[PDB]
């Protein structure tokens, strides 16, 4: 089965961001480099759309870090609570 629309949304967005970053630091040879990069980007979009993957569920890439941090916080709190209860 094909992967979800979110994967291409996120990968597309991050590729425009990284292309912007790499064109920021380059001075000469603009048109050819950007045309080649756009061709590579669109061909990679086609390849990833054609790709097949077993079904799965993925949460958005932007918010993984914060939710992970709160998960560690909950981890520590619940661990210490359980340890105290067991000691009593």
């Amino acid at each position: 089965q094909p992967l979800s629309k979110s994967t291409r949304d996120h990968l597309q967005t991050m590729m425009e961001s990284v292309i912007m970053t790499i064109l920021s630091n380059s001075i000469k040879e603009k048109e050819e480099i950007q045309y080649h990069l756009n061709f590579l980007k669109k061909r990679l979009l086609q390849q990833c759309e054609t790709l097949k993957v077993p079904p799965k569920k993925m949460e958005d890439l932007t918010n993984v870090s914060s939710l992970l941090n709160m998960e560690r916080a909950r981890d520590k709190a619940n661990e210490e609570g359980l340890a105290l209860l067991q000691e009593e």
């Binding site: 909950r74 709190a77 619940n78 609570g81 009593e88």
Partner: protein, 318 residues
């Protein structure tokens, strides 16, 4: 904090307009000289808007909000339906010397160790009572201030009255806290529920009867059946007494008796029924049934034994 502001605003919005000043005076968290600055002639909404600003300018915690909730609650105290507990002790145990501070500390610690996050308040009431407000929480949730629990504990006595809102989840824990803090071994729940806490109190302490005997017309109409009327009047007076009846509003009976009347003679199983009585002033409607002619002269003992047995819900078997 915004949460305490919202809590105080909601509590004040509950209060009726005419008696808001007495509640504010009893709470007396705000300075007296601040009160006359606010005018109560204007709209209720404007008054609460101003009061929020005054209480926000000063530092307001959650403890004083809980105290305001307790003060508001003990004025109304008919918005909830109450239940009774009874505690028992061992035969050889000596009479204890009650100390308020120790009771507060023990009741604090039991809840603090069993759960993790919990808010409990105290308001030492006159006439030898204690009001407690508890907000329930656990290790992984903050306390819920919307659904508190109130308990009235009479020190030196085996009785405590509790409100049934969310106590179903943590009933054994509160039972243990109460029986440990007051040095009692066992506890049981009396099957007597009502919305009138004072009537419950009068029944439970059995002080509804306070009379002690000490030495210190158109003759053309002829009423037959006069002797029967006088006899039913005498029987009603003997059975229901002469004191003012305590005010209840409900009574429930569960029946599991056999039908005995040709009709279902072969049947050997009980007939399953559940009946309820509801009235604005029960025990006063019941008293008037026999003179009006709707019941026989002596009522069945199940109806005339509410206050003497301190019972409200019954179960009957064959």
């Amino acid at each position: 904090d915004e949460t305490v502001a919202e809590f105080i605003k909601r509590t004040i919005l509950k209060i009726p307009m005419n008696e808001l000043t007495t509640i504010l005076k009893a709470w007396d968290f705000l300075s007296e000289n601040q009160l006359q600055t606010v005018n109560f002639r204007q709209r209720k909404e404007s008054v609460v808007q101003h009061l929020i600003h005054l209480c926000e300018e000063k530092r307001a915690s959650i403890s004083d909000a809980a105290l305001l909730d307790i003060i508001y609650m003990q004025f109304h105290q008919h918005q909830k339906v109450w239940e009774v507990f009874q505690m028992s002790k061992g035969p050889g145990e000596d009479v204890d010397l009650f100390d308020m501070k120790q009771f507060k500390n023990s009741f604090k610690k039991i809840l603090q160790r069993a759960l993790k996050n919990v808010t409990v308040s105290f308001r030492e009431t006159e006439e030898n009572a204690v009001w407690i407000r508890i907000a329930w929480g656990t290790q992984y949730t903050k306390p819920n201030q919307y659904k508190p629990t109130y308990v009235v504990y009479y020190s030196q006595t085996p009785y405590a009255f509790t409100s049934s809102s969310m106590l179903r989840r943590n009933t054994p824990l509160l039972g243990q806290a109460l029986t440990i803090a007051s040095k009692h071994h066992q506890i049981v729940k009396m099957d007597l529920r009502s919305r009138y806490l004072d009537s419950l109190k009068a029944i439970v302490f059995k002080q509804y009867n306070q009379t002690f005997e000490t030495h210190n017309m158109d003759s053309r109409i002829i009423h037959e059946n006069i002797v029967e009327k006088e006899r039913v009047q005498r029987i009603t007076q003997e059975t229901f007494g002469d004191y003012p009846q305590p005010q209840l509003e409900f009574a429930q009976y569960k029946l599991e008796t056999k039908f005995k009347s040709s009709i279902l003679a072969e049947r050997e199983e009980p007939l399953r029924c559940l009946i309820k009585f509801s009235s604005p002033h029960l025990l006063e409607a019941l008293k008037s049934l026999a003179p009006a002619g709707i019941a026989d002269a002596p009522l069945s003992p199940l109806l005339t034994c509410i206050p003497n047995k301190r019972m409200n819900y019954f179960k009957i078997r064959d």
